[PDB]
Amino acid sequence: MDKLKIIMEKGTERLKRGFAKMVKGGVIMDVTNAEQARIAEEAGAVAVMALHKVPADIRKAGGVARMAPVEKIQEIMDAVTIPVMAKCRIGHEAEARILEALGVDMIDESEVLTPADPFFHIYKKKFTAPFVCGARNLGEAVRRIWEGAAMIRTKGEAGTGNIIEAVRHVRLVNENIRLIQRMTDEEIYGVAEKFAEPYLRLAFSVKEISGLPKRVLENEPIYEGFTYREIVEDIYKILLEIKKLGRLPVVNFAAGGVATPADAALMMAMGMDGVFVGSGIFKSSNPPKMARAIVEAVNHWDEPDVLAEISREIGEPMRGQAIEELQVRMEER
Amino acid sequence: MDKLKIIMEKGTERLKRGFAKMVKGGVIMDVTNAEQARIAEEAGAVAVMALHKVPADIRKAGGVARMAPVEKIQEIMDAVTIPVMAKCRIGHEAEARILEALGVDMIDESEVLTPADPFFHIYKKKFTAPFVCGARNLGEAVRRIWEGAAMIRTKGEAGTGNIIEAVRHVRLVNENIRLIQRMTDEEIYGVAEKFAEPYLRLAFSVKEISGLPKRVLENEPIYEGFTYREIVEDIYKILLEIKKLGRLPVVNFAAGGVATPADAALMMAMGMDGVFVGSGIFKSSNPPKMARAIVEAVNHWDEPDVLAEISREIGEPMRGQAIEELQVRMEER
Amino acid sequence: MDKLKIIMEKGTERLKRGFAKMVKGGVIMDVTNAEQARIAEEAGAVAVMALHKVPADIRKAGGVARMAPVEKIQEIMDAVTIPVMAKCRIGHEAEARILEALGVDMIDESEVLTPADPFFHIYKKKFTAPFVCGARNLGEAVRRIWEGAAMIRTKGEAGTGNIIEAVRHVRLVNENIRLIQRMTDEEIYGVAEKFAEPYLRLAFSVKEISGLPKRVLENEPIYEGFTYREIVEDIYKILLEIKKLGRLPVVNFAAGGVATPADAALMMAMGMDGVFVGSGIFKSSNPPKMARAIVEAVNHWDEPDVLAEISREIGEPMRGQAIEELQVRMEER
Amino acid sequence: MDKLKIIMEKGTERLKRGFAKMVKGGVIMDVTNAEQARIAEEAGAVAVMALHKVPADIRKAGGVARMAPVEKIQEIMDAVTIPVMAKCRIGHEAEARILEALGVDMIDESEVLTPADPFFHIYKKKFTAPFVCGARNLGEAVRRIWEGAAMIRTKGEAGTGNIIEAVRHVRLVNENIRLIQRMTDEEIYGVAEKFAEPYLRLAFSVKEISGLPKRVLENEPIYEGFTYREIVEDIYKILLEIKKLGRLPVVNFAAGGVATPADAALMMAMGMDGVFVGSGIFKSSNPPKMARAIVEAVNHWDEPDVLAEISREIGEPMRGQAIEELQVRMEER
Amino acid sequence: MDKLKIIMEKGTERLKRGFAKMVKGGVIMDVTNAEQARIAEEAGAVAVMALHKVPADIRKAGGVARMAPVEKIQEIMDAVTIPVMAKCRIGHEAEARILEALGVDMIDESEVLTPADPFFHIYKKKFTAPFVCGARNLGEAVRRIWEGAAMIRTKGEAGTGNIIEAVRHVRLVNENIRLIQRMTDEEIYGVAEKFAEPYLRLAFSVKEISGLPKRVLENEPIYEGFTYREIVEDIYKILLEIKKLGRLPVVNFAAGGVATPADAALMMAMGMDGVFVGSGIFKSSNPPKMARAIVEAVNHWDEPDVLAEISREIGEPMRGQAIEELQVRMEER
Amino acid sequence: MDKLKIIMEKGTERLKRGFAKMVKGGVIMDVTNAEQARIAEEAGAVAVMALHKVPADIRKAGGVARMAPVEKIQEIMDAVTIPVMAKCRIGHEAEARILEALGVDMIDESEVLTPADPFFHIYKKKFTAPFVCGARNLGEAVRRIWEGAAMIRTKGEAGTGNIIEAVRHVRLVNENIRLIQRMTDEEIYGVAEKFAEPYLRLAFSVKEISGLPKRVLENEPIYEGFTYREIVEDIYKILLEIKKLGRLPVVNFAAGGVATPADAALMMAMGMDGVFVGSGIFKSSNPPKMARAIVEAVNHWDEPDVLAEISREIGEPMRGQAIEELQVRMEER
Numbered sequence A, B, C, D, E, F: 001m002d003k004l005k006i007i008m009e010k011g012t013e014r015l016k017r018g019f020a021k022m023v024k025g026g027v028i029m030d031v032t033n034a035e036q037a038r039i040a041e042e043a044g045a046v047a048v049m050a051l052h053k054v055p056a057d058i059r060k061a062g063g064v065a066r067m068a069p070v071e072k073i074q075e076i077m078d079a080v081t082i083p084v085m086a087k088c089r090i091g092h093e094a095e096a097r098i099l100e101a102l103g104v105d106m107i108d109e110s111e112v113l114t115p116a117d118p119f120f121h122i123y124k125k126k127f128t129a130p131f132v133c134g135a136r137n138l139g140e141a142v143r144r145i146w147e148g149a150a151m152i153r154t155k156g157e158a159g160t161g162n163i164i165e166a167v168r169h170v171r172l173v174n175e176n177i178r179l180i181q182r183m184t185d186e187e188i189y190g191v192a193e194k195f196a197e198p199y200l201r202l203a204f205s206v207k208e209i210s211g212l213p214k215r216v217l218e219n220e221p222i223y224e225g226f227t228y229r230e231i232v233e234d235i236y237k238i239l240l241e242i243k244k245l246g247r248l249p250v251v252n253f254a255a256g257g258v259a260t261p262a263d264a265a266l267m268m269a270m271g272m273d274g275v276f277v278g279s280g281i282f283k284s285s286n287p288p289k290m291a292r293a294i295v296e297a298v299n300h301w302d303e304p305d306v307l308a309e310i311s312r313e314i315g316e317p318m319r320g321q322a323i324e325e326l327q328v329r330m331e332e333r
């Protein structure tokens, strides 16, 4: 009864996780239309990511960023043989189920789209389709995993062409893992308690409205039927798995502001499994050339001579500094 | 002049509440003119909401937003067979009585119009026409109900095309209900005390002007003849009814920033009875298509395959992020 | 003379007060010229209020707003049979004596004109002409009365077409009266002390300049010969009269941001004796229609069916939300 | 030893004070050129005030306002028979000596010109020409007198056409006089201490620079040879003289923002000896009419019927409000 | 060695100081080119100051202000017989050595040019050419002298045409001298300690970087070999010399914002030896006239009749205010 | 890694350090293209620095500044015989390895490019190519050295044409060396502790995320395998070497805002080994002239007569003041 529940939770999880492994070692490319899908595939993309506008443009446009039009996603799935992934707004369950129904290979609960739910992410374990989610540090990654993400990427700062935020997120996650490895089981439990705190945020908001103190009550269901303590337990388990593994239990990709072959190489060299690039490619002057270049960079990242030759023709990345990013997009939690 | 005022008034409450049930399961559409009224009806709207400008436009125009011109409301009631509802300024009793006299089916005391009274809402129990009111959390909803609202909706952030605020309000209300259900009667009484606090606001202002301390006096009439403690009692009663019911005693709709079929479906899927959409439809590129789409979305919300087919043609959208909403229309209390 | 002079002077207040009663139940309309005076009278205005520009325009123009040109006031008094009232700057004694000499029926010491005196209002008891004054709460109203105002109105926020500030002022006054009625005589005395505080303001400024502590000295003449304690006594008397009367001892009108018939009706329904409207009428698209409509609204305010019919044709101009009123004209004290 | 000099010292002061009395009861008009000098004289100005630009224009122009050009002052002295006064920068001794050498009848050490000395005013006693100075309260007036001013005016807010600041200054001065009259000699001495404080400002600046504490040293020469205590003594004397007199020992005029006949009347009615008006007249639409009108207003100020007839034709640009005066010219001290 | 060193320090210092005396009693004029040099000489300038742009223009141009081009300085030295002085950036030793090699008569280490060294001024004693330096108070002047300045001027606010800052600086210096004269030798030693503080600024910055407390260490070499205590001793000596002398041991000129003959006269009348004017003359409408006028003003500054005649044609000149000077240029310490 | 990796690290380090010595005594010029490379070489540049845009332009352009296109670097290495150096983003390891592969003679880890890593610099010891790094004080310089920099320069404020920041950094470094020389070994150890602090920054961020206190743990690996204490030890060694040497163990150049021959001369005269100039030359009006001039200035820096002659024709680089540098590029740490 209980044990069988626990059993499909795990067989299905492992299957979903399994899909992610297919995409490992390659580049996944944001694509807004049939053409771009083709350019992407032709350039050696392991898969494309369908959205309405690339993040750089999302930034320029302002307003609300939602799931791509169904027509567009269709058109893209038709244009290519490789897996098609698509983006949905954080917490927006309906968008995800439409995406799943449409037959996309993976759904990305994306912090670049305007979040739908201020409190919770989608509960991903309920879906058949596998999810990829963003994380700016290990707490985030673990929560996202616990909610059922089959793959995680760094958030970085999307559409900025600036690799710094991606690098920060990778280092934060990695150092946090190494810290876990140096801890006693009990200490790790404390970290698990900290990492589950965000789920309390609804509850506490409501305690405040009701003129009660903001306290965690032991039998109080917080999220999707789970008690705070229950979440702390499950997370704790995941942290232990991580301590053993030395890395994340799922495929872990670098994302955001990859603008040049060297950028991609750098991420790979930091121990990432693969690279997501949207804006770097199509906001570039020669998109197909840049595409192929980044692919070859990810395949050759440990070979400086090759990296050097790979980067001999293209004209871009473009722009957006520390000062005036105007919507710092690494917030979901 | 008997138990007449107790047992008749309750009969009337239940009647008023009764009207609201007619509209349940469907979409109510903001409409500024005869044409839009028609497109709405034709698209399967269960009812239309008459106002001068759709919220998105209200925002753009600035200045004072009042009740629609009587001519316009008339014109709209003529154009369609389904119920016509109309908006009035918070606390503006005269506007409401004119609306009622005009024979509208329901009056919305709306936080999207410029509030008329900084202290109090309209005392709705005195009206024959039934009222719908906005709420951003349970305290608000309960107060609104106590004042005689027959139906409540979430405020969301009107005219932003952003579903986040609506979702926040639904979650706050729901979690607060679950919290009530886990409470002893005495604890619930405490919450009732907290929920009645806002009525003291005009008393306290005057105490301060009078150089007295701001204190609640036991026999002091605060609002429409009621003592603070009296309000606390009635509210408490309502809370208890909620505890039993597991939901609100009246029809409860989602509103504010529904921009796409998926949005409406998400609201339905969170347990709302129905959806209000103004700006999402007529600020969209193909209003009739979007209208019918949202209707069919609300009818088919638990069927992802249908949702998917339903949103295959429309071009539509809106502005309004987070940053620079410039108005933040989620205030009435 | 002594005893005769006394007699004359005591009964003078009641006479002045008496004039105010003539205007009770109707609408007083701001008018800048002969035509507007005519339209006003024709529309059933009980009286006109002569000024250089209507408040909405006063706002737009910036700069210093003074008494209207004598020529203009003349021209207006000639154009109509009903009482002509005129505005003067707060504390500007000369402007008022010129107004009185010109034979206006009432002088309004108006917070919409640029105040002349940062410390004191005109001492109105010395005038033969009766004064109307603005008040945003009971303290203000009582002080203005004590200085000899024969009639008081709410300040509201003039020229905004927004009824909210008017409503706030009405409620603050009323609640403060109810509070008074629930008080022991001694308590009321305390309120009297609080209400007379503002007169100390020029004393204290000078104490500070002189390097002395800011203290009330018992025999020190503050205003027009009166000691602070003397003022406290007179005010206390007036408060007691209010406690008895249940309202203000003088005719009390609603003013500012009345934009539509329903607005005026609302004010009447809150227990006001009558309505001042300047901007609502002439900044409206169809001023004579709006004028007559507001008059008929005030006459028919308890009759929703009539209010409804009354409001069937007009198109009036509205502006000035909460955000960016830029002037906030509710200051005199 | 020293005996006879006292007579001399008193003698000159009284003579200087003398000249001021000639101008009492009338209007002094700012004039920038020969024509305005003429219009002014013709209109019954007792004297003209020569400057480069009228204060309103001084405001508009920004930059440094000095000393009118010598040619211009000459040209003005030629154009009229009445006394010519001229403005100089605060503390600018050279400008004053040139003005005196040029044979002006009075020098105004004016807070409307850009101050020359951040610490001290001109030591006026050393001059043969008599000085008029501004004061925004009694401390200021007394200091200015002690430095040898033969006449003082209120500062008001020059060029604003707003009488408020003038009225404030008059009230502050008057109430401070009445406060003096109610004081024991010892108390008055305290006020004298406070009023002499500003002279310490350059001493203390230097103590701070020298890393000493900011203290008053008893034998230390602050200003023009005088010890702080010495100044406190002389000031005390002047305060006593004021207590006896009930007013200032010198001719006292109202100044700044007088824009209309009623304004001038109001100042006279508050007990001022006369009125300075620059901007009110020549920034008016009909300068000669307005000029004559203000003159007749000052002659007839206690006669409302006359005031009323007097202001039957003119109309005059007047710009600036409380908000955004941008300069706030009442600072010298 | 030991005994000859002093004779030599004294000898060279005294010679350098000697040059300054040649220029005493006259006007030194900022000049950007051959023509201006000529106009200056012709007008009775005792010397010219060569720079790229006059201070008013320096302000307008923004960017970095350096030593004039060598060609320009050459061209100027050729154009005139009187001494040519030239400006260099604070602390910029190389610019000064080039100026000296070019054979200028005096170098000005100027706070109007963009400072080169945030910590220290040029050590002037090492140079054969004599230096003039700015000071806004006595501490500054003394430090500048100790570093070997042969002449000092007030900083004022350069390019503003506003004499106020010059006057402030003159007063601060003078009062601080008078304070010195009233002090015991020990007290003066304290002031010496205070005046030598700024040299510690680069030491303390480094202590903070090194994680040490900011303390003065007794044998620690702060500046050009000198220990802090050593500097306090030398400074103390100079202070004593000042106490005896009643003034500064070097020629002391007024500088900055002298815009009119009366300005220059005022400076002279405050006990300055002479006047620097750049902007006042060439930003004037009639530069040669203004130039000659200011010269003649300095020559007859105690003769009001003459000053008055001297100022009969020119206009205006220049402008700035307190508000928005945008680069307050009196800093360097 | 026992006794042979002390001597073998000495070998490679000393070789790398050796290359730097080749460039000592000359000017290194930023160059964006073939032509500038040529002009540079022709003008006596010891080496060129290849980048996409000169720092002044980097500032103007905003956006992300990365490594130069490979084509451009190639083109430059072809155009000249002297060493070609190239810039890379801080911490961007891939860019550096591509640069090294391309065969550049030196890599500059430059704070003028957009940093890639918010936590760490490239670990330079692992590279065969030698690195030059920027430092704003001794702590920085030492850390950069420990990471394996073979040469260090001051950061200054790049592209501002303002020598002040360069001078500040030189003084800060120098005074901190002198401070070191005055310290006991134990004291120096404390400085070593302080200088190693920045490495803890990513550890502590992660401790905070994990809800632990921010503490240094003794066996915890921080950077490239090293424990905090280990770094403290290595740094301490370097400090001691500095104490002996009286300067930095590597070639030390001045950089940042050198705009004129005198600037370069000043730097040399402060004891720098040579000068970097990008913007000063090519943003100048006559680049070749200015180039040769700065070279000859660095060769002749102790000869004022020569400096003087050397600076006789050129004009330019208006650049950027203290106010509104808008970027403040001296941050890496």
Ligand SMILES: *C[C@H](O)[C@H](O)[C@H](O)COP(=O)(O)O
Residues within 6 Å of the ligand: A030, A049, A054, A055, A056, A087, A108, A110, A112, A155, A156, A157, A158, A159, A160, A161, A255, A256, A257, A258, A276, A277, A278, A279, A280
């Ligand atoms: C969908 C995902 O957010 C996207 O692929 C990455 O964040 C990339 O952002 P960018 O590479 O387009 O800047």
Ligand SMILES: *C[C@H](O)[C@H](O)[C@H](O)COP(=O)(O)O
Residues within 6 Å of the ligand: C029, C030, C049, C054, C055, C056, C087, C108, C110, C112, C155, C157, C158, C159, C160, C161, C255, C256, C257, C258, C276, C277, C278, C279, C280
């Ligand atoms: C001048 C008089 O008080 C005026 O009519 C009121 O302020 C009403 O203003 P509004 O109704 O024109 O806003």
